[PDB]
Symmetry: D2
Subunit: 386 residues, 4 copies
Amino acid sequence: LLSPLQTARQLAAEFALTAVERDERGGTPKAERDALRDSGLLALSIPTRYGGLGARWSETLQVVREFAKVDSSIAHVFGFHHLMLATVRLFSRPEQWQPWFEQTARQNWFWGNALNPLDTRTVVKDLGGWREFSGKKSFCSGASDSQMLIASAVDESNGGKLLIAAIPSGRSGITLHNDWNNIGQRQTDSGSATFERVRVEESELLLDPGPLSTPFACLRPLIAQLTFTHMFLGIAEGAFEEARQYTLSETRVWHKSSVREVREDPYVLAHYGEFWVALEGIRLLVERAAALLDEAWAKGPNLSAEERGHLATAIATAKVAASRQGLEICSRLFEVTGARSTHASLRLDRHWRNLRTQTLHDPLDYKLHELGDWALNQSLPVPTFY
Amino acid sequence: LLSPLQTARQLAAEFALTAVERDERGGTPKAERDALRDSGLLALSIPTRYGGLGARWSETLQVVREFAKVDSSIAHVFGFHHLMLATVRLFSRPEQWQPWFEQTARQNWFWGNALNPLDTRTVVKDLGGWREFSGKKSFCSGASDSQMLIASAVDESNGGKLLIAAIPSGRSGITLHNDWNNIGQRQTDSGSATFERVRVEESELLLDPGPLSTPFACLRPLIAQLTFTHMFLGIAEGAFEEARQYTLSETRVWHKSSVREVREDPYVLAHYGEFWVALEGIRLLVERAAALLDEAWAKGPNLSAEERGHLATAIATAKVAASRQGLEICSRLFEVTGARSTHASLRLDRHWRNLRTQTLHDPLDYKLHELGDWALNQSLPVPTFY
Amino acid sequence: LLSPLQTARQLAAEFALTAVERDERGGTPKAERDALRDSGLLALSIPTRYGGLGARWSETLQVVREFAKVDSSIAHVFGFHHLMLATVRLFSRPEQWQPWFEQTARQNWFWGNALNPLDTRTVVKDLGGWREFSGKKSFCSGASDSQMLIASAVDESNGGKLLIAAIPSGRSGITLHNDWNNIGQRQTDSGSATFERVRVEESELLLDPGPLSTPFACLRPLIAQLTFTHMFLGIAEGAFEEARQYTLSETRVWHKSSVREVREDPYVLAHYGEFWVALEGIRLLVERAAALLDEAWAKGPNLSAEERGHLATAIATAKVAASRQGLEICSRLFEVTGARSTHASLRLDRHWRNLRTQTLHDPLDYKLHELGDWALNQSLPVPTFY
Amino acid sequence: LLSPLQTARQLAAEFALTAVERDERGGTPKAERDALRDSGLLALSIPTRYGGLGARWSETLQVVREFAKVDSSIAHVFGFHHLMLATVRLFSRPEQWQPWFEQTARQNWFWGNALNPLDTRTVVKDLGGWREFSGKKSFCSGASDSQMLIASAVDESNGGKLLIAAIPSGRSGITLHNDWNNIGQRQTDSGSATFERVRVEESELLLDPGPLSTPFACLRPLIAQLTFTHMFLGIAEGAFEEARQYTLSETRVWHKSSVREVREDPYVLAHYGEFWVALEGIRLLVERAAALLDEAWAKGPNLSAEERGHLATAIATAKVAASRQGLEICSRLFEVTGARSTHASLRLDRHWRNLRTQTLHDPLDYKLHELGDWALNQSLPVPTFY
């Protein structure tokens, strides 16, 4: 009866009831992941001809942003789920990803991450008709309580070429350790995994056209980067709104203030003006990047390298603004909520913690280096794994 | 044969040949204003039915922004000219502004500013069938070398209510001092004037609906504020482009640098990345406000107070970002141009000086206060004179 | 055999072995407080003629700063203990504070805080030869596991004047709730308490000269403010040292870096240069304020209001720099420690959490307001309760 | 009748009467340089046994700071004059610098700069008993209206080794072009020069111990760096004080302000609090560097490399804070002086211009790299020319 956005807004209102408790507990949010299974949003990005909803990427990422306002962990695993589907859609043949799309929309499969282009501990051995992955991996976001995984391994014999495959999460030889113990993103299950002679069929390798091939295939790392960017904006929007309610309800004026109510304090209003200017700038940069992704995705295999590069620059521009100005909002909001807002039962610092931990996996200094290379030299970004 | 934007860019190229020498000289850019007269751009905002070009406000403000990249003083007087035309359009009867629009488009009249809501020195005396303005005025931007002026006066008999009129710039009793001597905006002719029993006919009064009346009439201060905003963006864009060319042509690497060329220095590239993130955020905010102005203007006298309020918030949001981040670009650009870019023949500081002097008339602390009142209390800004 | 600074450093080393686990646990650090009892440092500020160690305030605050580098909660309760001793020294007669100094140095009494000038719930009733406190109090830092408390109450019969007393922490009618549950300062025991007809003798009242009386007595709020300031500097120094060791031991260079080791990465070195500039500025400001406190304290009751005012300005100046630049260090350090430094077993965010929660009780916007009133108008700050 | 500091304060009060006019004119401040000749301050740094005043370096640099508050150009040439005397004192034999010291104190010689370790256009040829310098030089601060110059040349035959000499400014073959045309430091005469077969005696070469030899000799670039640092603080202190007088005298409240007078506006006072916190931090860092220079200078040829390095780090720390926070003060002060403070007759932007132009010859990014190398790796700075 409701559109995807309304369905996501209804789920997020329910997630918000337990978001503070679940930040303290951590672990796997089994009940929340089951609600995502039952809502049908796991097929949001799948076209209608496969039983999906057929949303544009801007709409899919809008839901990730909506979840990140109340629960950035749920947003992370949800956004990564659609990133895994985008991975098989871009790296494999239609004979592969079409059945995967159909089965996902029908059985509500949850896709987790086991792909790390820097963790080289997992290697692949060829046994003729099948492959075997062996080694350890780190940062396996969404691996727990998932049906499918995107797993990677290095060749060693082929100069260390990276190999990507789509395998069931419960396949023999895969061990999810569930050792994720972080200060933020505490319910993304980004722990480690162990692969011991994990059989991989040739029909499960994502080779045509494979990673980092056509500019269309090179949308994969950009989708990953723009997924985090929508999460960052959502975190800041959620921290801003929760700070707004605390200021208006349970915040007393400083005893030296000239205003009787905190709604009219000049310094408080100045802080809120700063938050607004920052958020409005981030919103437009993120949404423009989302619109450019929609138009680039529509090009399909005809996508040009120049258009891919202009999209990469727009995404990184939004990601820098979302990272820096978003983190400043999550810290400065305490100056308008008051000394009583630091009570442990509120966990108001969770927004800063979640944003602080995720903005580190992609150092801002090297993104500014790339944006400056474009601004000064008109150099397009080089396609690499995210 | 050429669109107004192409005509503006062609003028801006010629203006740039003398912009540095004219910044030192100050005074009235008479040759540059005569080029605007012969270009037809003085009728840009006038609808085609009155002999004008019929551009939307976003297109007119884009030309203001394009002139500001090379000559912010010309952009200032050009934007204020169209602001004066919007003043009679919004405040007076069609029997008044229609002939004014017709004669302006036909004779290329240059409209100047003699309106100062915060200067109480000019008073109006009612003689019966006509009135007379008497007093002193300051900040009369574009008054010199103009054909018409928007002049204001206070009625000390009616509690000090402000009265606005449109009178010929050379009417008996009007004396222009040409004492404009400022560190920035040095060719805006913003000196002082003296009114000695200047006759004002009743037909020249802007009374129906008059200033600060309907939401449509309350677009006048927003157009003024958005005109400065496009100028602020243009100044920053011009300083960026000029710094870019200097970095690529004359700047030498520091002797202790790691790169052999300044194009690859990581600190230089990081600075340009910061400039790009800042500029892209300003550009989207400014263009978004321009689009809402187009949509608001199209409503005409059916414009609601709520839609006017959302436009005011969008304009102020873009003005804060353009003012703060723009001035930071005009200062930090010297860190990538080098110690030899401060030669007085280049006047590279003129962008900073122009932006620094103009951001003072609208103090940012009170704009942040207004934006915070909306962000926290959802209070729409009260329409006032700009 | 060891100086007090050497004894403090030796304790700080042992405290650091469990500081991370105790930050998660919260509650009362009973073992750490017993170590302070056996170390003799509870008599650090007491003159040698009363059995104490006779340190100057700069030396006592240096120990607070040294404890804050590894355990800001212990530094908080340790600094407040000496603040309570300064309270009776400045507010009461020598016939009162001399025996208190003697017994404290001889029995290693731990003095806690029950003073809250902004909590009007505790009232005093005059029964004739004695009085009784009744009401509820919050933010009772160091009240648990303490021998003496500085308690306050309001006299609703005399216009609400605040009355301060020094009473045993275990006197009949005093109930400690131990409900302190905060994101930071998690072992300061700053929970709430309830006073049920708690008898207070006239000899226990701090009336001569009493609070906010002479300039010498007005040093009490400045000592409190400077105690937090040394804690803020210590937190930032501790976070810096811990980030330094992590950078040199566990941090790995970004895969797109230009250096083979993280020690030579230009962005990493630039961050550490910013931390050094920030820390050196804070250190000098804090130590300069400590020196003026020593000189002010030496004047005794001959202290002038002007010298007290210049000290207040120097302390607030150092507190602003320590608060703002300190918190920035605690956040930006993650950009040089890396994505693997956010593991929950390290609790590297504890420095930010501790500093973020404590800077809220003294809002910086009003400290800047006070400092501007001196910088512009040369107006000395009015002595008030801290 | 007056001490050096009082004499400098009396000169600076007279310089301030014409500082605004002379910023516009530029050129050589002949009258002001003659006042320095007549005051005896040109012998401030010369010991008493040579007819000088015998000031410590902290006192000499204090005068440079005092001049920079009213006239940064005069401060620059005055500070460089004593830097030239320090050059012969550190690089040459007492048989050379002692007569130079005596003649300077007796005849009030003004020493100018012609030393540029990066401008390699001036070469030296050996003719047996004498040398000849030939080439062009840039940035010859204080060369005009001077009696002695420190001139440098490259050997070419000895692998390009730099050679430094002290020669009379009016020697045959030297041509001072007086083409200094800059946006700031407009009266330092930092134009170019031409050397055509300029004879240099062997007794005029500064070779024992020569440049960059002993750690004591390596104080020369540190004195140069600390001279600029005192100038930067003086510029910011002077801009702050001139802004203070304008705010209190001729600054109107914003018409939307709640305060009746500008002395009590909350945003204005906040800005002044920010200025105070910044200035106080810079003052302590600069003065601590000045004290360390005094103690290092007293070591003489016994100065250790470690003590020289710790001084270099302290100086650079003060220089970064003085450069960045000083420039921010010179820009932000316009937000408290108002829109009427940008009048060209005030030249209030001259403080920002002077500081902006000088902070570029020593890029802050590479100083932070050096301070970070110490903060992280305990690496002392490498002695190089300034």
